[PDB]
């Protein structure tokens, strides 16, 4: 829903934060 204006950060999928 782009108009919500709360996009998720482009870490898709979550990966090992290392």
């Amino acid at each position, epitope marked *: 829903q*782009p108009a919500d204006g709360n996009p998720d950060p482009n870490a898709n999928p979550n990966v090992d934060p290392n």
Partner: antibody
Amino acid sequence: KVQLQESGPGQVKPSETLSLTCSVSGASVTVDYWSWIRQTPERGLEWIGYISYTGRTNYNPSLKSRVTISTDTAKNQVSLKLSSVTAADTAVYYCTRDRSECPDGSCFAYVMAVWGHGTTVTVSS
Amino acid sequence: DIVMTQSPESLAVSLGERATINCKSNQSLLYSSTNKNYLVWYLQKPGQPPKLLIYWASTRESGVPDRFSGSGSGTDFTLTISSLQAEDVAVYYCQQYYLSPLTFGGGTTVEIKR
């Protein structure tokens, strides 16, 4: 293919909590977005909410207070809990795999690409 | 919430004729940053879940026959079936995937006149 399969109890009694599971094949619940939808003759199709690949949940305000959506990455499953059910919650319930669009460093969903077969839930005493 | 309204609620045309279904929203579905309309079309046959036909208003999903096309922009959208086939009888739904909560039209029943 992608295949989603909902499991549910058939009937639930008034004021109990409905628990449903969506088993996912051919896709990972760690990716993109996963919605729950329900359908009745009178109301048509109603979106309940989704969960994103970050764990962020987004619920319909018509239901927010009573709904939880979660994922189990180990089992590659999506779940729905709906508390304090009434007859108004009788419906066919579907889980969906929703695709993502990420114009530049951030994503949102744009389509319910694959739906499960559905599970029929009747709330009755 | 965005309200989605379909017209007609039912239609029937002869085999091979054109069928059109209209869907209107009460808020533009055009996202200026991508210049796409966040409108989806599904069909549903009995005992089956809805199946995806068209997204971003006019992009056809893979495996869908060529006779299905979507058009429109802003608040007024149309699904066209250029040549209705017997297997196409179903309830057709539009959906906005633009602003939460996501919302659906009420469906249009498409039938064959034989």
